[PDB]
């Protein structure tokens, strides 16, 4: 997996690769319907890394709640992540450490700002960039070399950290999802 | 074990080897009466892998509920087998990852799409054709080369897919079961 | 242990050697009075795998129940067996797999036909016979070479595997303990 | 340790050796006053191996009962051993294999039959002897060798077992202590 | 990670670098926003080293306080640090030693004293300077080094030890963020 | 792998399945040309069980030798299998236990008698009938029960015998390959 | 890595994938010039899997010989194997099994017939088809499908198996080679 | 495996069971017919334990030495087992303890006593009778209870030591071999 | 470490970065004069990744060789560094896998082509750029969103690949060294 | 520590050394003034070994009885020890066998016998003397070659046999402790 | 084993038990002839713990020398058991501590004086008594006890050593063998 997050120019896009693995085994975009990493939750886009089973989760979780959480700063988006780990636990069946794993690392993409969630709920609020997946170290060569190019905007810097992932590890693919949005004022 | 599963030309087939394997050795439908992998539901048809007892505990799980299940979306299918798998461990005798595990790959056949769940509940709805089981690869390739093949419907293509899976691998074994029905509008 | 179980001419018939094991020490039928390790439940005749000590368990068991359980389809027995694993956890200290173990593999027979029950509950029936225990592959061999000889009805099938398993293995041993019955049709 | 129990002309007879260990330790009965291994259950004898504490267990348990138990058949000494499991547990501060072990290995006389309880609980029925404790092979040899010598009776039978073990096993010591009583009509 | 915390001339400073870590990856305060590793708890500032995720929970958890915690004496401190250990583990998903660790080091700096608080809830007051993180070593070397240079305030010499660290450990990265305070009479 | 050989009536027969196995993929006699586990070796039958590999390493092994070795008696196949042992070792790279194993299960049928050596090196003469490789409790089974069916011949009985651990396990399957010869005047 | 070798029609043809791995980093043929895991030997064509270095070695190992080698019988090959596996430990510094691992598999084609030679030095001849590398299981099922289309050719079904496997493996990649000659009388 | 050894009224005997182990499968000497597990080193009868090559091994072994060794004194027992276990390791592939085992316990009868050495080259002479294998227990257990019984020569004794293991114990089996000989005047 | 190579408009560029890495210490190109990763070989320039002695040890053994080796080619590449593996082990004490590791990757440039060794003798000609190191796929992720800009030539590529591994890796430092040549006719 | 107890001539004794451990490091009578390993219970005296904290542990725990237990008879004793290994694990913080180790033996000498009772709770009941402790090999010798001298009486060889232990074993030391008693009628 | 040496009153003696082991078995002098511990060595004798193979090992290598050795000094004693153990590696294969062990602790009386030469070869020489052997803690504080006794000379003293293990330990049994001699001037 390979997921991408960029913030320039007052507009916000994220990405997404298509492949999933089953051990060493390609099931591409062109073999299964539901092939989205990004899910919407309330205004924000949500890609997601880890097993490809936590996307039919977080959807499923987020679905059950009253209203959709607020994802637009550092503290709200941790306080719904540690409230979302207990039910990963406790209703997902989720199995060292400083802190317990809840095994995804998300970015998050909206109007009011670019975050991302690792692992042990290391909640990041993002200047410019960034991307989580196996793939990460590619998408962020790329989109380091392409940042500033006065020709790509957000969305397109997005997708061509997606697409080097996708060109040189084993575990990312073609094609590329993507949204983007504007930023709130 | 080799279940596949196939949507072509408006037709929908699933298909399963029948040979039970006991460590070593071979337990063939010539001496197993009760030697089908494939049980119907409301519907579907279900086709599963794993242990030769999980088929005897989902025909007798389902059997229990109030009403069938519906199994014809991935949202659907996530939530019925989320709630199968707390059933399995509680009154089934169930026993690292991100998550856990089921212990069985299953293939879902129904007019309104075919789909599957790997044994982490991560659900997938299929275009094409799919298969699980330790002889999967085989059914995969074999598919792959014949899906085209205009002489050949849905069924013909799934049964090739368990025939080349039961040449090669030692999990794997004829007569193959299958089964066809029309996509619904 | 080895037990047989055959299915031949309208007759049903089962067998199993007398040879208790405790370490390397043989434990016979001219030491042991209680040596038999087929039982009687209901109307089946039940040959029992695994530590001597099951035999016991299960006569213990079933006759606490309200009546005898019917031992007579595939669906049937695995009710049976499934809550009978219940049982041997909390009231007979039973102590890696997909599902728990049961510790023992038995061969069910009754008019109604010739089943098995493997130690994950698989259940199984059969069409010609089966065997099961450390002798069971002598068994079986012995079986598939004598099953069609005219001379031989089922219950001489089923005590020959027994007598093939006491002649080469070290677990089992004369003499040979059977029963015979009419299929009912 | 090494008992042994006999059934020869209408005849029953158990016995016992009388020497306890502490890892290399010996600590006979010329040490030891109470140095029986043998106690009474009702009109049982009980001879017991494993730690020198199971008897001092057995004694205080089964005395705490409202009567002392029948163990004059497979089934009901199964029903005693199996409660007993529990309360060595529960009470006595007990701590791989097809079921929990008791932890001892116990020979029952008494005028209606011998029999002898193994560590998981294998209650069986004996026609000629049988012996347990680390002593038992030798005892068996012996007893084997002696059985059908005219000259023996039960309880010299019994007897010689124990001495067998003592001459050759680090674990069984002299006297040997032995009760005889007559077969029940 | 570095923290520093000094006291000199009537008063108070305490710093911290800005590098954040995700295995051998580099998340600078050039890309991440919250890159803060110093918060406010009343009138004290703590600065944190361990999982990036520390500095969340701490603010998090403060915060839903009835009063800040007075944390201007050493058994004040330290009562307040066990009752928070309590809820790491109890709400926090906190997971050898003489007493449970809290993964984390810290500093605390308010106008009546600087303090420490390392892992396993040892406090301490500093009569000149400390450093804690992988970085401290560097930290200290270098305050023990300019301490006592006229030119050099409380802030200057904290400052300094983080630059030191972030010279030469790779779990340190400029900039420093730093905080300075009058000594309370 | 299953390996028969049987012993009545004055003749003597072999036989063997002709299953290879690569983890749980199978190779049948009708992908692989070579198929054939049992080789001749001067006026003996020799059946493999073990790697695929030792057919080769021994037909190797044999055919290099000044004449090829007699193998009709149990102190002869043992100083034999003896030297070969030392030969899997220094020259085709053979790798708890009490002696060495040579990691591999034969039987050899000959004018002179029947016979096997285990992976140990324990070389015994049979009287009846015998079965080595991961089939041969199937096979033993099946030709005790019908050893002595006047109907079956040698090659029958032992044909038999691999049919039945070709019908019930994994590293067993058909054809069955077989050779009968007369037992020598002895 | 895929590996095919085919058998049809008086014709022989041998195919590989292009595609080489450095962990989960993928190196297509579009990054790497020498990408060919088929070499000539004699008139032979041998196709490589294991190790990207094999291909240099052997290149390298049959360069040096005298007379290219014949690799038209299982005997032949067999001894070729057998001394190649003595220079692979003794000058290219190649590292539980029956006999010792060579590390890669291989398919040997020329106009006498097709063989391969398994990393165990097991010489087999090949009647129709097969396949080696972590890619065969999809190139066997592909080639069973395909085998017998009187529309494919030997170099038809070769290529094909190596599609298969590219498409569902991560370890094999487009673009195919293959190459085709004619059978000897 | 079960050996047995005795001496007892100027008569010395030796025995052994004829069944081989592969893993929990049983080859009687019905199937095998070279189930014999004692053999003939000039005048003395060895009975050997262990793996069944070991008989193999042996004979060959004794068969290549340019004149039988004499196995009748402890210290002339000890100096061959010793040599032995050098050609054990050399020659036929043999694979914690204060010294190398040989792997294999043998009991030695010939008209000047009867012996044992056991895996670790402890050698011993005999007053009465011994047993080695897995089966010895049974046999010594069966021999304590027969050996004074006037009806029983030492052969009746030694053989009723191996059929008391074969009895109780699943490494042993029917039939029993066994030889006699006269206790040479000199002892 | 991060070494790349990049080929491009007739001409070739091999670029690395500074840092040494002692443990999580910094030794960067300000503190330490023998900084360079890349040192000559003929005409070739050689890239080192993996302990910085190796640089050390390749420059002692090539100075010592006869006339300097020809790395113009995949086969002589790999001619030369098998018998250089030989002489890691022999005269510099060097120390699961298929062959044994030489334990650095490196990349070669020359005149007439890019190439690359990985610690397996893994010799690559390469047809556009490539990276070694732990910094590699930053690089590579750069490298590929940059090689099309026409006013980027080779060195500038091969630059900002070193560039982009520094921004966001720990083993990775600025400056960055740098050769560029024409690639000969 | 070595503990004795001897019956003679109508009476009884009872002694141990006064030395502790800490490690290696001796706790001498010199140096601690609390250095009797014997206490009083009831009209009992019982020598304790194992840490050095039992003694305090069973004199605060049998003081806090209603009454003083009966230790005159093996039954008594049992019982008494039985319930109070219960107490050892609730209130006293006591942590592969047969059953729970009670982590001390004990003597246990009154007018009415002489008593053991072993950490496994075997209790024993000696007719001449008995002795634990690491000593008590070193004590039972000397106390044997002393019992049938005439000029020593019970206390002269139970003081024997800790000064024994003490010569030889870097775990007893000297002053020895004794009390003896008349035997009751 | 139990050996034991004594000096007294210008008499040298030194004793053994006679029991073999092997396993928990027994072979008592009444079933061996060769029972014997203690051989002759010119005119010292040596009595042997460990392997009852070193006695037989210790009598062909002394017999095999030129002249018996010389063993009544320390300096003397250990050379001969240094040269000892390098044959007993070399000739009769023998197999963590400082220095390598000998597997066997000895005893050697002659009229020059009483030695003892342990497992590590730690020769001494003693000037009362002692003993090795598992029974040696039994029969040193026997000797302690009964060494200055005015009716027992140095063999009775001796033998009284070894009786006391005999009666307390598994490893040593009756008869005691012992000799004696006169101090030489």
Redesign the interface.
């Given at each position: 997996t390979t997921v991408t997050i960029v913030r320039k120019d007052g507009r916000i896009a994220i990405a997404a690769d298509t492949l999933?693995?089953?051990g060493?085994?390609?099931?591409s975009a062109?073999?299964?319907?539901?092939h989205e990493k990004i899910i919407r939750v309330g205004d924000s886009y949500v890609a997601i890394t880890?097993?490809?089973?936590?996307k039919?989760i977080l959807?499923?979780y987020f679905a059950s709640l009253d209203e959709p959480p607020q994802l637009d700063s550092?503290?709200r988006i941790?306080?719904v992540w540690?409230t979302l780990?207990?039910a990963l636990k406790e209703?997902?069946?989720?199995?060292?450490?400083?802190?317990?794993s809840s095994?995804?690392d998300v970015l998050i993409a909206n109007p009011r700002?670019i975050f991302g969630v690792?692992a042990?709920?290391?909640?990041?609020?993002?200047?410019?960039?960034?991307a989580y997946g196996?793939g990460?170290?590619?998408?962020?060569?790329?989109?380091?070399?392409?940042y500033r190019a006065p020709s790509l905007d957000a969305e397109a810097v997005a997708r061509?950290?997606v697409?080097?992932?996708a060109?040189?590890?084993?575990?990312s693919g073609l094609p590329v999802q993507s949204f983007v949005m504007e930023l709130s004022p």
């Amino acid at each position: 997996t390979t997921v991408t997050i960029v913030r320039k120019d007052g507009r916000i896009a994220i990405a997404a690769d298509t492949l999933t693995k089953w051990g060493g085994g390609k099931e591409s975009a062109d073999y299964v319907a539901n092939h989205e990493k990004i899910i919407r939750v309330g205004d924000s886009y949500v890609a997601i890394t880890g097993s490809a089973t936590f996307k039919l989760i977080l959807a499923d979780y987020f679905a059950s709640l009253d209203e959709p959480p607020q994802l637009d700063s550092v503290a709200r988006i941790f306080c719904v992540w540690n409230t979302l780990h207990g039910a990963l636990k406790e209703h997902y069946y989720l199995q060292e450490d400083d802190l317990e794993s809840s095994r995804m690392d998300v970015l998050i993409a909206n109007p009011r700002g670019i975050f991302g969630v690792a692992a042990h709920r290391t909640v990041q609020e993002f200047s410019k960039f960034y991307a989580y997946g196996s793939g990460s170290p590619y998408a962020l060569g790329a989109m380091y070399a392409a940042y500033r190019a006065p020709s790509l905007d957000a969305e397109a810097v997005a997708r061509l950290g997606v697409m080097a992932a996708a060109e040189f590890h084993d575990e990312s693919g073609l094609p590329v999802q993507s949204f983007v949005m504007e930023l709130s004022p």
